[PDB]
Scaffold this active site. Structure first.
Site, PDB file in Angstrom:
ATOM      1  CB  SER A   1      -1.057  -0.274   0.881  1.00 37.12           C
ATOM      2  OG  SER A   1      -1.751   0.964   1.313  1.00 37.12           O
ATOM      3  N   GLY A   2       0.969   2.007  -1.103  1.00 40.49           N
ATOM      4  CA  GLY A   2       0.893   3.682  -0.719  1.00 40.49           C
ATOM      5  C   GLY A   2       0.723   4.141   0.076  1.00 40.49           C
ATOM      6  CD1 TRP A   3      -4.778   6.253   2.163  1.00 40.18           C
ATOM      7  CD2 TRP A   3      -3.879   5.543   4.631  1.00 40.18           C
ATOM      8  NE1 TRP A   3      -5.080   7.046   3.480  1.00 40.18           N
ATOM      9  CE2 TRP A   3      -4.489   6.657   4.909  1.00 40.18           C
ATOM     10  CE3 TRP A   3      -2.579   4.904   5.524  1.00 40.18           C
ATOM     11  CZ2 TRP A   3      -4.608   6.295   6.332  1.00 40.18           C
ATOM     12  CZ3 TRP A   3      -2.920   4.281   6.494  1.00 40.18           C
ATOM     13  CH2 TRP A   3      -3.513   5.531   7.057  1.00 40.18           C
TER      14      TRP A   3
ATOM     15  N   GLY B   1      -8.195   6.644  -2.392  1.00 39.22           N
ATOM     16  CA  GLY B   1      -9.367   6.065  -3.476  1.00 39.22           C
ATOM     17  C   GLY B   1     -10.895   6.320  -2.719  1.00 39.22           C
ATOM     18  CG  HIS B   2     -11.821   4.460   0.255  1.00 43.48           C
ATOM     19  ND1 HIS B   2     -12.934   3.962  -0.956  1.00 43.48           N
ATOM     20  CD2 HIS B   2     -11.386   3.416  -0.254  1.00 43.48           C
ATOM     21  CE1 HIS B   2     -12.662   2.613  -1.845  1.00 43.48           C
ATOM     22  NE2 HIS B   2     -11.442   2.532  -1.255  1.00 43.48           N
TER      23      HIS B   2
ATOM     24  CB  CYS C   1     -11.193  -6.072   1.186  1.00 42.72           C
ATOM     25  SG  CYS C   1     -12.232  -7.448  -0.053  1.00 42.72           S
ATOM     26  CB  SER C   2     -11.392   0.383   1.301  1.00 38.34           C
ATOM     27  OG  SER C   2     -10.459   1.025   1.666  1.00 38.34           O
TER      28      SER C   2
END
Lengths: 422, 421, 422, 422
Positions: C86-88, C186-187, C308-309
């Site tokens: 994940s880049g997050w 994205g969210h 599956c966030s």
């Protein structure tokens, strides 16, 4: 909260540093973004104050591009009063990916901060060697002016890069009005301008970063609009005067490039920048004066920056007399920060090519020739032929003597070939 | 069995390993490798290339490089290897960003990081040349890199050797100094390891190369010519040099000189591909005596010689001796010869002179360097054209391939480089 | 020679790997950009091959975000068949600036490659420890699928980032159709789409990088068009159907966001990627099915990926039966790569908060409870309670033994409190 | 220059910070090594002052090992008053070579300062978020105590590593009396002692670095002499009592290990350190009392540090009652700094193993279970549930609004699933 904000507002109102500078935000906004404590940035603060003073007390400041600490140290030893940190040179030979890149913002955004820190750390060591030996004669803490390109993204990337430059101890930072994802060297083709409003937002972002860090960092606004004949967008009505209506396949708008486009951008950026910089396609005195007069009509006394670019063929464009007088002449127009962007690249590559070719042909005769040229430069102030002393062997020997009460049996300069043969 | 046998066959059957002692088994090496083999292309090709060159050329002479651009110019000048000095890394190119003397003060992964940078610059040079339609110049010249005294114990040596290989080094040198008191060979205060300990470091170095599966060149350096201190009297073969006197730190005083150096050189010869004796001056007869001593026991053994800028060359040797020096020591078996600090002196002298000129005469000084560059193009210099040199042309072609030739933002067309050069 | 070109062109036209994939460039273009030698990328090759086989072997691959090698190592030991980078998570806690950032591409562009390399290196050590002890049962060399965000600039930043991912040993990489300078999670709100044509060029750039490196890396095309109601430009006629004509102060164009927009982008990207990923505002089976049906109408068999966030409130959106069956169900629609992006962030933060609070209140009774939980988990395949062994102390003991011919006095595990007490 | 010397000798003479502390060098020697300017180190200075005050006003300070900024941040949120930065954890999972290492000083010497810097920058961001939202309730700037191992070489390596720790903003630093080339974890076999004189010179080197940097950094002197039965040299007369005459193939001298040898080292180090630390092979109250009583005989009220080590099987060694009172009980002997070295490793590894195994068996039911546990922790001060806020998304939104004069159309929290679903 009261005191902290009032002190900030008082600084903006009273300090001549901020004359003719607009901040489209409040002291309360800055203190809100600062957190609960102030962190001191001694080199950034000292450097920015020294640079501000030098720009107003020197005839002009001429610098050379440096991509190592050692290059910066020899620049200070030769008597230069500022270091220029080229992003071009960092792309070529000194970026944190370890790749050789053209000047297109391909390297990691923290690369120039990293080299600012390296340069400041070499200058610290040079200061320590000198101080330890009993003098403070040379001022090694000269201002560093660093390249932030187009800020490596949007306004928040600009904010973070400005903070990184200050953290590293930069005195001044330049930002250009290019679309970061298309960024070019000012002397390459395919330059795409930002809208005027976006380039202004980048300069506001850099000032907000400096204000949050608590340091009066010099901001240089560069325009690429003399040659750039593309713009990302027609959104800004002031840019519609230059737009032809043709769009590229990418959606960029074609524009009428030239001095008119650059003057428009210079005038837009002047309220939000300490110096204005107009990239040019050749070293032309009339163009430099025209640009200077245009800015000076609206902002008299505005400080200007000039790229004495190695991307020019100097002897092709100018006679010997004009070359010799070029820097003194443009300084009289207000170009008070002047810099040869790629001097470090050209010095390093030419020097090693000629040495290695000599070495290939003549072995140790070629290397002895270099050592002899180094001995000959000592009377003009060169000291690096005594390399052990130059890099701080004496400083660390003295550290070891203080630690051991002068009993160490393993100090380095005593019994060295340097002390025997030099 | 398959992997064991393959490795065993290499050691026993290949000319590469003639005269080399491995005190461990092929089975030891595959137990430490893991379940898979990772390829190291630049490390393998460079080591093969270096080994061939050391046997086909009269000698290989190199200069210190501390940047990829310095290395690139050395290749374009026609040199057949690159030296990566730890001294230079200490001085101006280590991962702490500090200027240090040569005393193993910088972080241990620093020289590997410069090996990787130089290999990536050479890769770009190759990519530019290949795109323009030639494979004339071989840009992948072998890098011989300084591992100092291994930045600690036998396990630090093992890790550093792996780092050098991962970064694409062709050869690596290790010296018989106590890492915690490490010095430049031409500084005072040098402390030897016991012979047995210095031998264990070379074993560790070879075991790392074997685990990585690459025939890396290992140079064993002794500092015993001038080092008059040893950590310990533990090793019975060191007894003859130990006086019995101790320093306040408890180092044992030894009788330094060519005898101590020859003793270490002979001890290290079975565990290294080249032997290197640090000297206090460029002395042909000492060079000859060391060579004859080694060759008496190990005929044909490749030797390495530091043509050090720590010598005042004019003061020590006449013009005739300086002119013949490299061909003269090559005839004694010194097939790898390197000027350790050439990059430092080139960079520092060059910038001081440009900066002083600039201070005194502004752009007249810069124009002089630019004119010298243009003249140098007549014997193969290209960096005058800085946009092409760094791969602006390479990235223009990448952009044109991605966009199928529709890009409105290529760099070289409309550049001042195309108009003025 | 001209054979090395013909071979490459043949493999594109004939190999199953490249079924349904468009390359608008030639084999001759790739070989022109490769230089004179081929450099081997063992882990990137093996992992890409193993990821491709896995996607055609398992009903689906479910992964968790990992921001450290140790997290990835436990994911493998627990039986998961890929690692999600994940880049997050890199923004928040594991980037080369060392800052905590929101997910807006603020960190240096080489940060995710650095973490790929870290994770591969930990997995290599785990495999060495197992191999040395005489087992080869657990396959530690599981594929890593890494986040390249919006490529950190233009098509050349995309090319360089994709090369960095392959050098580090990534098996797959994902790229999203967002403006890099405005990149968001994205969210998050504030998402700006690229023109379809620009997003396609970014995918072409990523494939060209992988072809130049000579590795069949998995490319995941992500669209943010389900929620993104802004686009940079109206230049692409295929986007005009979604553009309202309203513009923002920055000059972005407002679009009608929703599944129709997302389907348009998915269809446009499918020929230029191995998997397609549609970001969603909630975990909804019906929307997942509509998206997959729309793609599969034009690209029957196309592999899809699903986030599956943890940005979803799962219990607010789905009952427990629907939560328990979710991955099994969307797998049947073709979502064969499923991942919990921020699993690592939530595991690391929650576990340390719980341990530190217990320790604040109860001292070593809280730490002893964790240690007893760890002993209880050893039956299930956990080994890290024996921390010395886990990190390879036994491997390095064996290296020292081989070096000394079994005479070392200073090996670590003999005489350890681990050997005596565990 | 008189003023720089005067302020230093005035501090050393008047400040009870320096009660019982011997400096074999002069204020003159410090100023000769500092250079021509004083550089401010705000976080190192404020942290060391806060730490000194805490050690005098509280019964004890208890910490957990942290290897990420997020771990450290949750330690603060849970109410812990210090952060421990373990070299063991850095070797395992957070060093600059990116390898998984046993605890044998194999990683690059600048790794622990890099993690000090990361943790301070994470705490700064948490402070900025809290400050912006309109309180300074939580003090995020808790002091970090960092592991310098045996200094990564000789006395000059110690000097550099101490400066690196202080530059990064560490409040305290620990050095152990082990030969750096053979360094082990305190709970591993094969440890080798320095002579007392050499161990003391390392501590002198650390204090000289802190004095040169101009910060009153806490120095912890660790001894490994309880279990170390090897020494490098018989050179120091005070060591001959412990040296047997037996040697190892390597040249190391066997010694009589145990509490007597540790007490000798503790007494020798006390004048050169602010805290003394004795590594033990179990958590034994009587041994801890005996050590404290032997130090206090010569140095009354000397502050002591205790490793509450995960290398001990706590339930094997002590009953429920003894574990629950252990920190209170040893605090009454003078153990004022208490730390669980590997708490970060065990939390990170156990948590991810448990989540991945549940995810393997129950897919999103396992992840939803973590998410609901996280919601349940909010009442106790856990906030990371709302991950977008936790990493500073709202901070960067307010930066964007300040830069744009409130005109940005791309702020991140407006329209986020976090604002909609949480």
């Amino acid at each position: 909260k009261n005191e902290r904000i009032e002190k900030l507002q008082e600084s903006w109102e009273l300090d001549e540093r901020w004359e003719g500078i607009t901040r489209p935000y409040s002291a309360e906004d800055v203190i809100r973004l600062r957190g609960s404590i102030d962190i001191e940035h001694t080199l950034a603060r000292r450097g920015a104050e020294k640079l501000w003073t030098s720009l107003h007390t020197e005839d002009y400041i001429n610098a050379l591009g440096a991509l190592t600490g050692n290059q910066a140290m020899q620049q200070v030893k030769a008597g230069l009063k500022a270091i220029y940190l080229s992003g071009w040179q960092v792309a070529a030979d000194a970026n944190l990916s370890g790749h050789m890149y053209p000047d297109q913002s391909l390297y990691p955004a923290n690369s120039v901060p990293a080299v600012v820190k390296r340069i400041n750390q070499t200058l610290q060591r040079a200061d320590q060697i000198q101080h330890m030996e009993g003098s403070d004669d040379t001022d090694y803490f000269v201002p560093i002016v660093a390249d932030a390109e187009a800020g490596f993204g949007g306004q928040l990337n600009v904010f973070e890069l400005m903070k990184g430059m200050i953290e590293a101890g930069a005195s001044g930072v330049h930002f250009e009005d290019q679309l970061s994802s298309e960024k070019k060297c000012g002397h390459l083709g395919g330059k795409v301008l930002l809208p005027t409003q976006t380039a202004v937002r980048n300069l506001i972002s850099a000032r907000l970063a400096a204000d949050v860090m608590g340091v009066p960092t010099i901001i240089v606004a560069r325009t690429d609009a003399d040659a750039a004949d593309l713009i990302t967008s027609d959104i800004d009505p002031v840019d519609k005067a230059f737009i032809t209506g043709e769009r590229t396949p990418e959606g960029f708008y074609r524009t009428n490039a030239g001095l008119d486009q650059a003057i428009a951008r210079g005038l837009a950026y002047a309220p939000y920048a300490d110096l204005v910089w107009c990239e040019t396609s050749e070293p032309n005195l009339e163009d430099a004066k025209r640009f200077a007069d245009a800015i000076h009509k609206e902002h008299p006394g505005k400080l200007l920056a000039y790229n004495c670019s190695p991307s020019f063929n100097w002897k092709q464009k100018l006679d010997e007399k004009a070359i010799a007088s070029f820097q003194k002449e443009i300084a009289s127009y207000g170009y008070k920060f002047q810099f040869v962007t790629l001097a470090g690249f050209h010095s390093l590559n030419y020097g090693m090519f000629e040495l290695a070719r000599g070495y290939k042909e003549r072995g140790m005769a070629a290397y002895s020739e270099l050592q002899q040229a180094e001995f000959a430069a000592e009377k003009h102030g060169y000291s690096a032929t005594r390399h052990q002393r130059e890099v701080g062997t004496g400083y660390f020997d003295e550290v070891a003597q203080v630690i051991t009460g002068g009993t160490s049996s393993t100090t380095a300069l005593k019994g060295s070939t340097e002390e025997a043969q030099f």
